[PDB]
UniProtKB/Swiss-Prot annotation:
Its main location: other. Its EC number is 3.4.22.27. Monomer. The chain holds residues 115 to 331 of 331 of the full protein. It catalyses: Similar to cathepsin L, but with much less activity on Z-Phe-Arg-|-NHMec, and more activity on the Z-Val-Val-Arg-|-Xaa compound. It comes from Homo sapiens. It comes from the Eukaryota. This is Cathepsin S. Keywords: Cytoplasmic vesicle, Disulfide bond, Glycoprotein, Hydrolase, Lysosome, Protease, Secreted, Signal, Thiol protease, Zymogen. The keyword Protease applies. The keyword DNA damage does not apply. One of its GO terms (molecular function) is laminin binding. The active site is at 25, 164, 184. Belongs to the peptidase C1 family.
């Protein structure tokens, strides 16, 4: 395993998106993971439809559109549905709509997904390096998270009580302090150009390694 990894360098991460008034962070976290796999298997990088998950991966999957969801059930939907549209053909309107999936504009498919063991940052590291970007949940209820702008984020009062779905696109160390490179979905005005570096190997800080998962085409 390399001392550091940044899947952006490998051209496997689309542009940071802005979820707006719709709390579909789970939707963005899920598509982000698939996008990296689509690129890794077709040399083509395309933003996948988050709206597609918000309108179609609903009750049967335990998801509530703009009111919250699960990355794993989002993957199962893509498998059951055998496809998901691209952002271009099924744009993000930031609100729940009637499912408008159209296989004519399918951009990717999913074969299965894997959930990693709870709290194991060493397994997450091995996955991020060898498999690609991993979808994880983090405790982002503290203001210190919102006010973030630079450096390795460390919040003493963080817990493993996750509530926000995001994407781990790499890891490394900045001045001795280890970190996870996390892509957020609050626009480019958050942290450093939409990303945030979170403390690594600090006892599953903010529960970043609590519920990791990634898709496989
Ligand atoms: C996205 C997070 S957000 O940007 O912090 C946000 C804060 C406030 C309002 C909107 C978004 C999203 C927010 C849900 C929400 C909550 C309250 C009001 C409106 C919207 N969070 C979720 O969708 C999470 C994602 C799953 S997780 O990463 O927390 C996780 C937990 C357990 C195992 C694995 C991963 N899920 C939910 O919030 N819910 C609630 C509804 O039922 C489905 C799951």
């Amino acid at each position: 395993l390399p001392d550091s990894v940044d899947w952006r360098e490998k051209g496997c991460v689309t542009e940071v998106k802005y979820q707006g008034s719709c709390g579909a962070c789970w939707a963005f976290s899920a598509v982000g993971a698939l996008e990296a796999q689509l690129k890794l298997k077709t040399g083509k990088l395309v933003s996948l439809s988050a709206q597609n998950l918000v309108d179609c991966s609903t009750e049967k999957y335990g998801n509530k559109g703009c009111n919250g969801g699960f990355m794993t059930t989002a993957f199962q939907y893509i498998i059951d549905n055998k496809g998901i549209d691209s952002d271009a053909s099924y744009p993000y309107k930031a609100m729940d709509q009637k499912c408008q999936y159209d296989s004519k504009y399918r951009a990717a498919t999913c074969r299965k997904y894997t959930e990693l063991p709870y709290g194991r940052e060493d397994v997450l590291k091995e996955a991020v390096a060898n498999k690609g970007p991993v979808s994880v949940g983090v405790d982002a209820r503290h203001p210190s998270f919102f006010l973030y702008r630079s450096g390795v984020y460390y919040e003493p009062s963080c817990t493993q009580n996750v509530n926000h779905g995001v994407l781990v696109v790499g890891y490394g160390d900045l001045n001795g302090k280890e970190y996870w490179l996390v892509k957020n979905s609050w626009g480019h005005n958050f942290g450093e150009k939409g990303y945030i570096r979170m403390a690594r190997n600090k006892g599953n800080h903010c529960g970043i390694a609590s519920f990791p998962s990634y898709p496989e085409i």
